[PDB]
Structure formats: structure tokens, C-alpha cells
Amino acid sequence: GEPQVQFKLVLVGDGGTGKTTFVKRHLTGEFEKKAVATLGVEVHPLVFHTNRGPIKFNVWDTAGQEKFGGLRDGYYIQAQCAIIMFDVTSRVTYKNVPNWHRDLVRVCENIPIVLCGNKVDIKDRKVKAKSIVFHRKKNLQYYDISAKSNYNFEKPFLWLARKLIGDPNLEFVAMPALAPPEVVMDPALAAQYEHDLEVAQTTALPD
Amino acid sequence: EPVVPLPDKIEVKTGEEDEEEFFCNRAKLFRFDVESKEWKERGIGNVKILRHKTSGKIRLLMRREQVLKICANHYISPDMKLTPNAGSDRSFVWHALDYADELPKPEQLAIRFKTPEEAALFKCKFEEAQSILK
Ligand SMILES: Nc1nc2c(ncn2[C@@H]2O[C@H](COP(=O)(O)OP(=O)(O)NP(=O)(O)O)[C@@H](O)[C@H]2O)c(=O)[nH]1
Ligand SMILES: [Mg+2]
């Protein structure tokens, strides 16, 4: 991409916490319901627009299961920031957070790190916000988030943008709506376009 | 060791300053998944119907809340048909060459509103936009 400003962002946390789902939610808008464990690492770009210009996160979506991969200490090299995801429904994933922090910072001294307690949409948190003290140290930050309900879902990125850019008033701004190219469809197969549009109209919308 | 210049503010240019609003309302947008044969969510946020003041072309534009990325961007065509979903008077489906991802991609899209009044207003304005595109 053309934005001159980019960051390497590694995303870590126990398997099943919703890391890949979160990245995807930012990526397409979709909410993947299913659980498919990330194999090792998936690298996905996320561009945001701001009052100071476009910025891009190169997100390294690492798998949290221990078992998939090899050199994750190697994935972490030259990373300029990170998110640690845990699941507020599952305390083990929060208790393991300290190893994620240790493991990241010994490969990268000064990186701004966010802790995210995903899945706050779920009715009974076993790990409340007020039990979150990990951020205490400077260059740390916590947010309750939910990839299901979008709750605080822009915030980890806003905060990191603010940190890495050096502007505490930095704001995400509207993505410019470029003119959509003067290229329409082919009506010869417009005969075909209807039934799949029916398949659509024959399919109830979830909820 | 090199340090770096706090880049300059650029003026926020939305791309809509050459257009006029026909319609503005929050809504939920869905995209039909061809492979799985299921609806997939595309975004929630403000839908707009816009007419260019010079070309007179009218398009549909939609922005996702919080991140403010575009999740729908395509010219409205007279050939388009707004077709409610099931028995729902809160939602409609249509075909479109969408440019949200900055690429002209065919999609079947569903849009759902909070009140049936908002949906009726969306239909009404949509069809009204095509009323000048015949
Ligand atoms: N209820 C609820 N479920 C969620 C939420 N976010 C993610 N999930 C669920 O969490 C499960 C695991 O998602 P995933 O992102 O694959 O987790 P992961 O951390 O990537 N796993 P891995 O590390 O092994 O790749 C999925 O079934 C998804 O539906 C949320 O906000 N609410
Ligand atoms: Mg994953």
C-alpha cells in the first residue's frame, strides 16, 4: 500500500479467545461464528484514515494454541506494537496473559501493548474489568472489547495509532468515498443474476 | 536512532462534497455469501443516497461505525430491484457492482432497518432516485 506510515503489529493470546475473528471483523465486517484455529500466523493489512493521514497496521495474527507453528519468537522480531487477547469468559486465558507479556517484551523492549478482554457480549464475565491491573505500567493499556457487538472494537487501534504516531488527539476519520468506476454489469447474463438474487431473497436474515 | 516528524494534518475530504444527500439513516448491511449460501454481515452504520451535483449520477454509500471504513459504494441503476427479504418490511435485497473495497465487485446485498418506517423511506428514496434515472 501507499501510506508512508505503517506498523508491525503482532496479535497474541490463548487459542479460542477471538484473535483471528477480531482481525477478520476489522477486515471485512463479518463475524465468523465458527472456530478454526489459526495455523501459525496469518499476516493481514488493516488501513485506517486519520486527521493526520492514512496509517496501516501489518497485523501478524498468530495462533494462540501452543501447538501450531515453531519460531513465534521469530514472528515477534521488529514488531513495534502488540495486542494481547484473552477471553473474559475463560480465566485461564487471562491468567496466561503475563507469559504473553514476558514473551513479547523480551523480544521487543519498548512496544506499546494493549490487553483486550474479548467476548464481553457474553452474559456473565468471569473476569471483570476492575480485576485488570496489568496495564498499570506505562506503555500498557486495557480495553473490554467484543468482536460480536463491536464494543470498543476500534479502540485498541486508535490507542496504538495515538502512541506510535505521537498525537494523543489523533482521530480516525471517514474513509474518502472515491467515485466508483464507470463500469457497469453485463446485462446479457442479467438473465442469470436473478435466481442467485432469489437464493438471497429465499434466505432469512439471521435474527 | 533517527527520530521523525509528526506528520501534518491533511484536510479531511470525504468525497461527498460534490454530492447532495438524498437519504441518510443508520442501518445494518449484509452481503450474500455465494459459497456457503448464507448472509454474511458487511457492516453497521450510516447509509446515504447521494447525487453528484454535476454528473447527476446517484449512488449508494455506506460507512461502518467507529472505524469509518466504507462498506458499500455503488451507483444506483434503474435496472436494480429492491426486493424485501422473506416477509420482513425492515429489510431489502438487491444486486450491485460495489466499490467499498475499492474494487468493482458484484455482490448481492441485504439492508435491514430498525423501524419499518425507515425501510419504507429507504425504498421510497431509492426508487425516487431511479425516477430521475429513466
Ligand atoms: N460470543 C462470542 N464469541 C466470540 C467472540 N469473538 C470470537 N468468538 C468466538 O471465538 C471462537 C474462536 O475464534 P478465533 O478467533 O478463531 O480464536 P483464535 O484466538 O483465533 N484461535 P487460535 O489462536 O487457535 O487461532 C470462535 O468460535 C468465535 O465465534 C465474541 O465477541 N463473542
Ligand atoms: Mg487465531
* Residues A3-34 as b or e (16 or more Cβ within 10 Å = b): eeebbbbbbbbbbbbbbbbbbbbbebbbbbee
B12–A174 C-beta distance less than 8 A: yes
CB B121 within 8 A of CB B43: no
- One DSSP character per residue, A60-119 reads EEE--STTS-S-HHHHTTT--EEEEEEETT-HHHHHTHHHHHHHHHTT-TT--EEEEEE-
SS3 A27: helix
Alpha-carbon dihedral A27, A30, A34, A39, rounded to 10 degrees: -10
Locate A73 and state its grid cell: 519468537
- The rounded distance, in Å, linking the Cα atoms of A21 and A69 is 19
Dihedrals φ, ψ of A135, to 5°?
A: -60, -20
CA distances A143 to A79, A83, A170, Å, are: 21, 10, 18
In one-letter notation, the amino acid at residue B101 is D
Q: How many CB pairs under 8 A join A and B?
A: 127
Chain A hits for B83, Cβ within 8 Å: 197, 201
Best of A55, A178, A183, A201 to disrupt the B interface (most B CBs within 10 Å) is: A201
DSSP conformational letter for A188 = T
CB contact A46 to B (< 8 Å): no
* Residues A79-111 as b or e (16 or more Cβ within 10 Å = b): bbbbbbbbbbbbeebbebbeebbeebeebbeeb
The residue of chain B with its CA nearest to that of A151 is B66
User: Which residues lie across from A113 on neighbouring strands?
Assistant: A82, A140
* Nearest C-alpha neighbor of B108 from the set A193, A206, A26: A193
CA distances A124 to A89, A90, A120, A121, A207, Å, are: 7, 10, 8, 9, 22
Chain A hits for B68, Cβ within 8 Å: 49, 172-175
Q: Is the Cβ atom of A84 under 6 angstroms away from ligand 1?
A: no
Structure resolution in Å? Answer: 3.2
Q: Ligand 1 centre from A36 Cα, in Å? A: 8
B86–A205 C-beta distance less than 8 A: yes
CB B12 within 8 A of CB A172: no
Q: Which domain holds residue A37?
A: 1-207
Handedness of CA A177, A10, A17, A155 (dihedral sign): negative
- HSE-CB at A206 with a 13 A cutoff on CA atoms is 14
Which domains, from first to last, does chain B contain?
A: 1-134 (2.30.29.30)
Q: Is the Cβ atom of A158 under 6 angstroms away from ligand 1?
A: no
Best of B18, B62, B68 to disrupt the A interface (most A CBs within 10 Å) is: B68
A200–B93 C-beta distance less than 8 A: yes
A174–B68 C-beta distance less than 8 A: yes
* Nearest C-alpha neighbor of B26 from the set B94, B122, B100: B122
Write the CATH number for A134: 3.40.50.300
The residue of chain A with its CA nearest to that of B85 is A201
Dihedrals φ, ψ of A140, to 5°?
A: -110, 160
Locate A18 and state its grid cell: 477471538
Residue from A14, A19, A21 whose mutation best tests the ligand 1 pocket (most atoms within 8 A of CB) = A21
The residue of chain B with its CA nearest to that of A29 is B42
CB B73 within 8 A of CB A177: yes
- The rounded distance, in Å, linking the Cα atoms of A119 and A94 is 12
Beta-carbon contacts of residue B25 (< 8 Å; ≥ 6 apart)? B46, B47, B113, B118, B121, B122
User: Any idea how long chain B is?
Assistant: 134
- Domain total of chain A: 1
Experimental technique for the deposited model? X-ray
Cell 435466481, residue located = A195
Query: Which among A26, A31, A176 is the nearest to B41, CB-wise?
Result: A31
Give residue A37's Cα distance to chain centre.
Answer: 15
Alpha-carbon dihedral A60, A65, A66, A72, rounded to 10 degrees: 0
CA distance A124 to chain B (A): 25
Task: Report residues near ion ligand 2: CB below 5 Å.
Answer: A 19-20, 38, 63
B6–A183 C-beta distance less than 8 A: no
CA distance B79 to chain A (A): 9
Strand pairing of B58-64 and B38-52? antiparallel
Locate A59 and state its grid cell: 497485523
Q: Is the Cβ atom of A18 under 6 angstroms away from ligand 1?
A: yes
* Residues B60-93 as b or e (16 or more Cβ within 10 Å = b): bbbbbebbbbbbbbbbbbeebebbbbeebebbbb
Beta-carbon contacts of residue B35 (< 8 Å; ≥ 6 apart)? none
- The rounded distance, in Å, linking the Cα atoms of A142 and A88 is 13
Rg of the Cα trace of chain B? 17
- One DSSP character per residue, A154-182 reads THHHHHHHHHHHT-TT--B-PPP-PPPPS
